[PDB]
Amino acid sequence: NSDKTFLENNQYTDEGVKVYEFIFGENYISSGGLEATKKILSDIELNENSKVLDIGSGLGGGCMYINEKYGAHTHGIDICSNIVNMANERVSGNNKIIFEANDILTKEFPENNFDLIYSRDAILHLSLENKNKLFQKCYKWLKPTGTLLITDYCATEKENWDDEFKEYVKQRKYTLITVEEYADILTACNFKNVVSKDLSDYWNQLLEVEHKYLHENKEEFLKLFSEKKFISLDDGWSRKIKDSKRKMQRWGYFKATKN
Ligand SMILES: C[S@@+](CC[C@H](N)C(=O)[O-])C[C@H]1O[C@@H](n2cnc3c(N)ncnc32)[C@H](O)[C@@H]1O
């Protein structure tokens, strides 16, 4: 009843994680790395007394940035123990950053605890039933004055997927839904002021920067990895660029409040 072994042994092996970090940037394994993070948080207000939860915290770049910018207490949860071990090696002497290995679906936190619950491209791993269960937990865990802030991989309606896109989703065991279905889940969970944005155009821009970087730094990549891994990454980004342009694969942004 867990995907922990599946994730640790395939997509998020140590080397898999290091390949992602090469292309996304130091401390990041998701879209746009540091630059997208600055943008996503540009209108967010927190301070040194704030409490933040990062769901699917990865190598911890997001927690590092939120703590640096605001001085906030940050608690990241990630199901992959090897990734959490790597995250903890990236931070020292800071008792306001915590990284914990756990399945968010089984983790308990106090009701009315967090000023911000933040997640970047992680919830795509959860089944539709579990997305709904997670957002019910998030609603409970947010302070009355708290905010939910998410980016996640979305898609056009499943009926519209082509062969290559179906294979991509199946191989990774992603559950991708439309930006609109996702927003409706938040509304159903009683979140208020639900804002969704289809950021597929911006995502396409981020992908192009990354793809260019990969090509310009191929020699360095090959010193670290193998040509086989290069080709896989290169082809993967090419498909994401193509599919984001036509909105077959989409990038969703969601912000909501508890009250
Ligand atoms: C995009 S990657 C990490 C993203 C990270 N926020 C970043 O921007 O670099 C997705 C992460 O979600 C985590 N994840 C998947 N299912 C999870 C679950 N059920 N509970 C906690 N973390 C999970 C994976 O371990 C993985 O590190």
Contacts of 5 (CB under 8 A, 6+ apart): none
What letter would DSSP give residue 113?
Answer: -
Distance (Å, rounded) from C-alpha 2 to C-alpha 126? Answer: 10
Give just the sign of the alpha carbon dihedral 140, 141, 146, 152: negative
**Single-letter amino acid code for the residue at 104:** I
Which DSSP state fits 135?
H
Closest CA to 135 of 170, 183, 171, 103: 183
Q: For residue 191, give the DSSP letter.
A: -
The CB density around residue 59, as the number of other CB atoms within 10 Å, is: 27
Compute, in angstroms, the gap from residue 27 CA to the centroid of ligand 1: 13
Instruction: Mark the binding-site residues for phosphoethanolamine, compressed into ranges.
Output: 11, 20, 153, 168, 172, 174, 240
- How many domains does the chain fold into? 1
| PDB resolution in Å | 1.5
State how far Cα 160 lies from the chain centre: 24
Q: Which residue's structure tokens are 């915290």?
A: 57
Binding site feature residues for S-adenosyl-L-methionine? 29-30, 56, 78-79, 103-104, 120
- Ligand 1 pocket by Cβ (under 6 Å): 7, 12, 28-30, 56-58, 61-62, 77-80, 83, 103-105, 120-122, 125
Q: Identify the CATH number of the domain in which residue 184 sits.
A: 3.40.50.150
Full domain range(s) for residue 224 = 1-259
> Which DSSP string do the residues of 15-53 spell out, in sequence order?
HHHHHHHHHH-TT--STTHHHHHHHHTTT----TT-EEE
Q: For residue 57, what are the contacts with CB-CB under 8 A and spacing of at least 6? A: 63, 76, 77, 78, 84, 87, 99
- Distance in angstroms (rounded) separating the CA atoms of residues 117 and 143: 10
